[PDB]
Amino acid sequence: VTRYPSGTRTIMSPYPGGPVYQWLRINYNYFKRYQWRRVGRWQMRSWCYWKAAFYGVPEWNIDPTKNQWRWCVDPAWYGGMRDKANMDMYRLMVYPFFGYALLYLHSRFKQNDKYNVFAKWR
Amino acid sequence: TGFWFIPNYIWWERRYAYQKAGFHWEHTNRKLQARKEALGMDKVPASGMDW
Amino acid sequence: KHFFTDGANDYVTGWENTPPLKFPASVMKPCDYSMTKPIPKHWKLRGSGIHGPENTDLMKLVLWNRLKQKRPQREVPNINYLKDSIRLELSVNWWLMSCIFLWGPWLHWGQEYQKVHEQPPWAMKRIDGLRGEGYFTWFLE
Amino acid sequence: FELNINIINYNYLGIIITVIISIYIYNNSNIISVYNSNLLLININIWMKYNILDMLNLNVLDYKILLWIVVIIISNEILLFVSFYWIYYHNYINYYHVNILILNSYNIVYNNIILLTLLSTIVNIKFYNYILSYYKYILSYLIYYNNYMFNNKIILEYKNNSNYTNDSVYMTSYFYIILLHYIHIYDSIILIVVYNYVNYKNINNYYININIYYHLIEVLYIVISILLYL
Amino acid sequence: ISTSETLNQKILRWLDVTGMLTRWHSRREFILDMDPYFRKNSGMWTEWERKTLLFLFYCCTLATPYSAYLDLQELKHQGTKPPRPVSLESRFMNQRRYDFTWMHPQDKFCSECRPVELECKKMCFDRYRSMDYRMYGFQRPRIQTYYSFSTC
Amino acid sequence: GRRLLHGNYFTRYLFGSLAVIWIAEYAAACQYGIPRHRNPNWMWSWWLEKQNQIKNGEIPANTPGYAMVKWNNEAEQRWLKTLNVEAMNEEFARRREAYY
Amino acid sequence: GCEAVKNPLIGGPNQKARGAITSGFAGGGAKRLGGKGYGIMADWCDHGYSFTKGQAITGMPHWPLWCGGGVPDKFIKIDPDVHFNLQGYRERIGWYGFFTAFLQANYHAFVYFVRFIPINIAIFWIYVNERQREPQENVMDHEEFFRDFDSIYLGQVFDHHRFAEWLARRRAVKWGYADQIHIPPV
Amino acid sequence: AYNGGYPFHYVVQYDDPNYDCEADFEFEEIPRDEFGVPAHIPPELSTQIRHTYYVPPQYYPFLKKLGEDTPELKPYTDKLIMGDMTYDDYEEMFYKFA
Amino acid sequence: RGSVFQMPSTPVYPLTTTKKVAPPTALAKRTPEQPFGWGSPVREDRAWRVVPRNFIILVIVYLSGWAAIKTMLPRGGSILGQIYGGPPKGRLI
Amino acid sequence: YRHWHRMSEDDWALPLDSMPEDVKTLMATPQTERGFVEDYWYNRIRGEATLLDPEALPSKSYIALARDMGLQIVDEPSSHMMGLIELYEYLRGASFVGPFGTIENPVLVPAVGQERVVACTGGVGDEEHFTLWFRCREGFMYRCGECDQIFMLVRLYYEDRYWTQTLVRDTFMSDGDMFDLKTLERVHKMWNKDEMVRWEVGYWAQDYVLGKGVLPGMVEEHTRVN
Ligand SMILES: CCCCCCCC/C=C/CCCCCCCC(=O)OC[C@H](COP(=O)(O)OCCN)OC(=O)CCCCCCC/C=C/CCCCCCCC
Numbered sequence A: 001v002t003r004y005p006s007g008t009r010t011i012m013s014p015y016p017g018g019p020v021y022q023w024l025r026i027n028y029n030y031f032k033r034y035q036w037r038r039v040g041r042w043q044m045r046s047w048c049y050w051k052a053a054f055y056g057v058p059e060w061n062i063d064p065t066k067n068q069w070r071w072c073v074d075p076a077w078y079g080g081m082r083d084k085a086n087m088d089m090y091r092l093m094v095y096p097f098f099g100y101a102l103l104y105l106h107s108r109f110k111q112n113d114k115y116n117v118f119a120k121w122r
Numbered sequence B: 001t002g003f004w005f006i007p008n009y010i011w012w013e014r015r016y017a018y019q020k021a022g023f024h025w026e027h028t029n030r031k032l033q034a035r036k037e038a039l040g041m042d043k044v045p046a047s048g049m050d051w
Numbered sequence C: 001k002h003f004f005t006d007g008a009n010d011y012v013t014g015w016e017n018t019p020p021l022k023f024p025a026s027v028m029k030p031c032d033y034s035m036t037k038p039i040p041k042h043w044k045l046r047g048s049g050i051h052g053p054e055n056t057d058l059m060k061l062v063l064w065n066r067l068k069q070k071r072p073q074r075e076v077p078n079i080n081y082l083k084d085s086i087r088l089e090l091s092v093n094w095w096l097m098s099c100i101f102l103w104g105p106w107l108h109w110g111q112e113y114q115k116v117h118e119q120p121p122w123a124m125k126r127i128d129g130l131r132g133e134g135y136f137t138w139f140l141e
Numbered sequence D: 001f002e003l004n005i006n007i008i009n010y011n012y013l014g015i016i017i018t019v020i021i022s023i024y025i026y027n028n029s030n031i032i033s034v035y036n037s038n039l040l041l042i043n044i045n046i047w048m049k050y051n052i053l054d055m056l057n058l059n060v061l062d063y064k065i066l067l068w069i070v071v072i073i074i075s076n077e078i079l080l081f082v083s084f085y086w087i088y089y090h091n092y093i094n095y096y097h098v099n100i101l102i103l104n105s106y107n108i109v110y111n112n113i114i115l116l117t118l119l120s121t122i123v124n125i126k127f128y129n130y131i132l133s134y135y136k137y138i139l140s141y142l143i144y145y146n147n148y149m150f151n152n153k154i155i156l157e158y159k160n161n162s163n164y165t166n167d168s169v170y171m172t173s174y175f176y177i178i179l180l181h182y183i184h185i186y187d188s189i190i191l192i193v194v195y196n197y198v199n200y201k202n203i204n205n206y207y208i209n210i211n212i213y214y215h216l217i218e219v220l221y222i223v224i225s226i227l228l229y230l
Numbered sequence E: 001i002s003t004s005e006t007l008n009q010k011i012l013r014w015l016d017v018t019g020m021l022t023r024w025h026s027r028r029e030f031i032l033d034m035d036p037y038f039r040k041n042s043g044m045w046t047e048w049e050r051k052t053l054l055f056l057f058y059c060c061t062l063a064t065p066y067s068a069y070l071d072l073q074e075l076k077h078q079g080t081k082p083p084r085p086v087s088l089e090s091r092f093m094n095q096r097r098y099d100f101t102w103m104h105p106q107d108k109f110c111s112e113c114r115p116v117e118l119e120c121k122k123m124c125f126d127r128y129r130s131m132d133y134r135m136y137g138f139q140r141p142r143i144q145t146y147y148s149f150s151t152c
Numbered sequence F: 001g002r003r004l005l006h007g008n009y010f011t012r013y014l015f016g017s018l019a020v021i022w023i024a025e026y027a028a029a030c031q032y033g034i035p036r037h038r039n040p041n042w043m044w045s046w047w048l049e050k051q052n053q054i055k056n057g058e059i060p061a062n063t064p065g066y067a068m069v070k071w072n073n074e075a076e077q078r079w080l081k082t083l084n085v086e087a088m089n090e091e092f093a094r095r096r097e098a099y100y
Numbered sequence G: 001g002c003e004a005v006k007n008p009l010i011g012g013p014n015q016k017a018r019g020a021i022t023s024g025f026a027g028g029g030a031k032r033l034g035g036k037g038y039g040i041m042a043d044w045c046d047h048g049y050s051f052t053k054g055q056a057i058t059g060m061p062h063w064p065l066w067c068g069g070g071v072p073d074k075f076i077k078i079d080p081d082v083h084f085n086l087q088g089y090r091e092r093i094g095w096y097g098f099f100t101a102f103l104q105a106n107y108h109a110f111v112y113f114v115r116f117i118p119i120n121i122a123i124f125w126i127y128v129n130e131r132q133r134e135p136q137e138n139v140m141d142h143e144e145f146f147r148d149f150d151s152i153y154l155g156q157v158f159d160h161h162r163f164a165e166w167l168a169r170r171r172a173v174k175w176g177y178a179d180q181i182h183i184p185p186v
Numbered sequence H: 001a002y003n004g005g006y007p008f009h010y011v012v013q014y015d016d017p018n019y020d021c022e023a024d025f026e027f028e029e030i031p032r033d034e035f036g037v038p039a040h041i042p043p044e045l046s047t048q049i050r051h052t053y054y055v056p057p058q059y060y061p062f063l064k065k066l067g068e069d070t071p072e073l074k075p076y077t078d079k080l081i082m083g084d085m086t087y088d089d090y091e092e093m094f095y096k097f098a
Numbered sequence I: 001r002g003s004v005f006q007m008p009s010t011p012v013y014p015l016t017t018t019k020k021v022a023p024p025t026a027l028a029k030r031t032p033e034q035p036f037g038w039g040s041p042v043r044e045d046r047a048w049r050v051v052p053r054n055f056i057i058l059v060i061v062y063l064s065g066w067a068a069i070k071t072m073l074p075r076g077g078s079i080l081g082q083i084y085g086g087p088p089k090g091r092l093i
Numbered sequence J: 001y002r003h004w005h006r007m008s009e010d011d012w013a014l015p016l017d018s019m020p021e022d023v024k025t026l027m028a029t030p031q032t033e034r035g036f037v038e039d040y041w042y043n044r045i046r047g048e049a050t051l052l053d054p055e056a057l058p059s060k061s062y063i064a065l066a067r068d069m070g071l072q073i074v075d076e077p078s079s080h081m082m083g084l085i086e087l088y089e090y091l092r093g094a095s096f097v098g099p100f101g102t103i104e105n106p107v108l109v110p111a112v113g114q115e116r117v118v119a120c121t122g123g124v125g126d127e128e129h130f131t132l133w134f135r136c137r138e139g140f141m142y143r144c145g146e147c148d149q150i151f152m153l154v155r156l157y158y159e160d161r162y163w164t165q166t167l168v169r170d171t172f173m174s175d176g177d178m179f180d181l182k183t184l185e186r187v188h189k190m191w192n193k194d195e196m197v198r199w200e201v202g203y204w205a206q207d208y209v210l211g212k213g214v215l216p217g218m219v220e221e222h223t224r225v226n
């Protein structure tokens, strides 16, 4: 029994088909397997949302006693300096937030004419 | 807290004064009437366009 | 089945309360010693007597529930199980076919009739002189 | 012997997310609100990463806990829609005799029901492949096409509708119910954009959650179609 | 026209131009169209599961063109939606307690127009443009733009 | 493999509930003697009489309802100033000739 | 500050002496490029499948869960002893390193935004493309509509091409560009 | 009776010694199962085919010694010697002596 | 190398006749300087340099373009307004 | 147990890349000095060396055969400890039900520390009472104040350590005759010849004894790219 390359020869007819037919069948097979599926492979491997959650996490040692960082360290800081840096960066924004929030209170207080409480009756 | 309050305060005060003077299009309109008076032309080309 | 149930559809761990029926009772049996005959008085308690792995059946259940996770081939389920696994999928697909080949044709006929006679073919023609298509679900009028 | 649970002792995302929420209130610009929404997305994604990293505990009850949370959430989504249906039917006695044009029962309902049904079929195929430890690349892009068409159709409908929200409580309820469905459709886009094949397979709560949510949204549209269009 | 095949075979061959029918009637051809990573798990599938999957997949993909046709007709209908009578302002119609500004809390564009009231906004944008303030939209004729679905 | 709900629960409680609702409604109508014959029309008797006159040819075709009342509001006075039923009928007649 | 920041490397010798681990890439051991290896093998660069080259760079992830297992010591690159012990890490990395670490801590959020933005751009294109076009004539005079109800209300279904042309001419009259456009004949 | 009959862990074999299911993107190689059944032969058919373990004959004397020392174990060892022990027979032997 | 479950159907090891020198990591051993990773070839860490560089460039382009648009184009309601939102050429306001 | 999650791939076997590269020292290390990975590969190399030598199996005693495979011959001391270990593990995610405790046979409460919280529910049927919680500290024979059920704490403690499978194996198993590397080589040549390797573990193990990279194809096997 002769074995043809996968996806290149039809089994529905003893006649392989005419030139146009064969061109369409061969080229769709190529486009799917080596052109279209480049996008899918790229998204599946290079942009996995679950691989990205384990980025920067230490390897899981085969020796069971060398993975104690799992419970010695909180999961929020499994990333070492990267995870400590993210927390520290947001920490730097505390006082800028206070000034921003305090401004909003001033904005509402002024717009309601609450600063003229004494000037109103003077 | 006061240090970061100043830059926000300055920005909002300028913004508040502007908003009380009128809407964005009312401001551009006042500059359009002035340009029409400077040239003495009833209708002038819109900003960024030639005659 | 889609939803996970610890007792029946336990696919997360694969735990089964009882051994396979294929196994002879001499090889493995369900953990049930409710029928144990009364213990002779001259017998003395050596073990804890606590329900747990000291009982042979329970031990074998735990062992099998872990060693069954590697098998040379698939345990083909019968067609009844396979149908149930995708019951919703197949039913939704047939619903789509109904919407295309049953709902589609008569809805088109009604609109074409409405074009000529102002109201759908399943409605009472009005004489009030108001204009427009009017209601579509006549049995909710 | 180990402890039954690997306790989480500290967390700082909660403070950030709660502050992000306050920014929505304490702001003087709507641009600040747009960028604040991005911050929210980022930090909610970090919380999701914490959930994925909790897999290292090998705790059997984790799947069950998360699954039942989704059940509760779905329930809350169903009850919010109920409240809108309630608002709609309470004023039913003032409908159908006002000088407004209600929606047709031929065009919008059919193409939408046909469209949303195809969305369900795609998700169903995804579930089937999930069961069979297989993947088909084209599936997700069919969802993107379906979402694009849904967005294209809803935008045109609103823009070409000749009755406004202030015309009648009927019109307000129609627009609001349709918008609420759309928001839940957009949330489905948010969830589905990350769909990929993970080799831990049926211990991944994402797959079951997506299937349940998509079915909820489609079923919710059947109820809406009967109430408003038919 | 080839006479080396029957009429039925010819029709089936052409419907198999993309190999769909061949993959249905050959397990080997279906497994060798899978990418190697997923082909590893193929040997466990039953033939029931395989053909049922193809059936669900084929039904879905073959109905997508129909939905696409239905959606195109919808776009054309909306693109040439008939004018409707101007609404008489009834007892409880067009009630306003304050201007429409929730979309633009600070800018307050088109305070009198409703959020998606396109004709009111067009005339409002024209006023702003006449006031030297640029606004986007409502300037190109529909028939002179792409994707309008309003061309004859 | 253990079942929690009725084997056909979805169809059972959906179609079943619809059936009970429909049957209960018929029973309720019988007990109160409610007329069950659907009328799709308005019941304004004077209006329905004017409509018959139009169908009989007593009132010319396409004559507006405000051209027949004994009190007109302001907007209908505006319309009456531009109303020409005779011209409208001639225009329709011209269209029919062109079509055929 | 430390040698690691000055000379970034992935899985070199003397990691502890260098003072820090600058790479989040974990695993390896593949015998070929894109082949089966150990660990998850995730990074901002040089991982996964290359679209331009159409080739696999790293194999599919080997999860530290039931589906996989631990990584052999020969191929471990993130030593927990050096990865942790953050005492005075800011001095070792400097200010630019702190900025780099913060940016690198958000790879998960970056991966999401790369997958989420495209569909939203497409939705925004729908809006922009429609906003440019003149508004369709939603409403006309109440009276005139009812004096020609059949033509207006049913014209579309009977002949859509002529109805489309009629609509276009009305738009050209409503917005005063009729003499500036040539409406194609139907 | 768990996970639809799909084993959580199973062996796969490849004919080409340098084949990698993750690096290569060819479309001709057909994976085999633990017994060696090619993937294109469905499970429903292959599971009916009877597979037995064949040990090298040099092990027969050892398997004989095991049966004699433990007579209850003899029937299973005899099946193994005669090439009549399937996977199920092995499982029965394993759990019987736990 | 992969899972212990995947394996060759015939267990063969090639008698390589090539005379290529052995890569250093192929003959390496665990050492006090290298407790881990001694079997993997050392590589450059591009992410440490490319991530902060690319981020800075994008921010600069993003902000610079925004400033430019909002300062070098006529005042308007949105960015699209400031670009395509003027009156038709020859329409004097 | 029901509380455990799914078997890992490692739960069945370890990758050959985790084999220690200094096999010569590995086979000479005492059991008490071998780590988990070292102990896995010591047993696998030695156990498979004896199992892949059919002509010697019939003349090998079960005591010697068990030693080669690394299996511990059971005895009452070790059985007691292992049993109480498995009972502790089972109770982690299972209910605690058993016979009524008396002075002759107290309820056995396994613990690692010196205390474990316990509740008495009384007897069966009408003799069952509401949960009475008490702290079961070592060295006291506790009696429920309500039903007089006797309790006792059992501690899994041995020589400054708690009881584990590793501890039980180290304390009771005795290292036999030192493993001979000649056996490894002899079995290696038996099943590995002319590019056919029917003992992969012994091909890698012999390569390491030779110094790593000596056997055909092994340099190519050890050359990785990431
Ligand atoms: C000796 C016994 C012989 C028996 C012969 C039986 C012959 C039966 C023939 C039945 C023909 C039915 C034709 C139905 C055509 C419907 C076409 C139609 O409406 O198309 C448009 C419509 C959608 O229109 P829209 O514009 O979107 O408007 C509606 C939604 N807004 O499309 C659809 O409905 C799609 C589905 C079309 C289904 C066509 C069905 C054809 C059935 C043929 C059956 C033949 C049976 C032969 C039996 C022979 C036995 C010996």
Ligand SMILES: [Zn+2]
Residues within 6 Å of the ligand: J120, J121, J122, J123, J129, J132, J144, J145, J146, J147, J148, J149
């Ligand atoms: Zn008691």
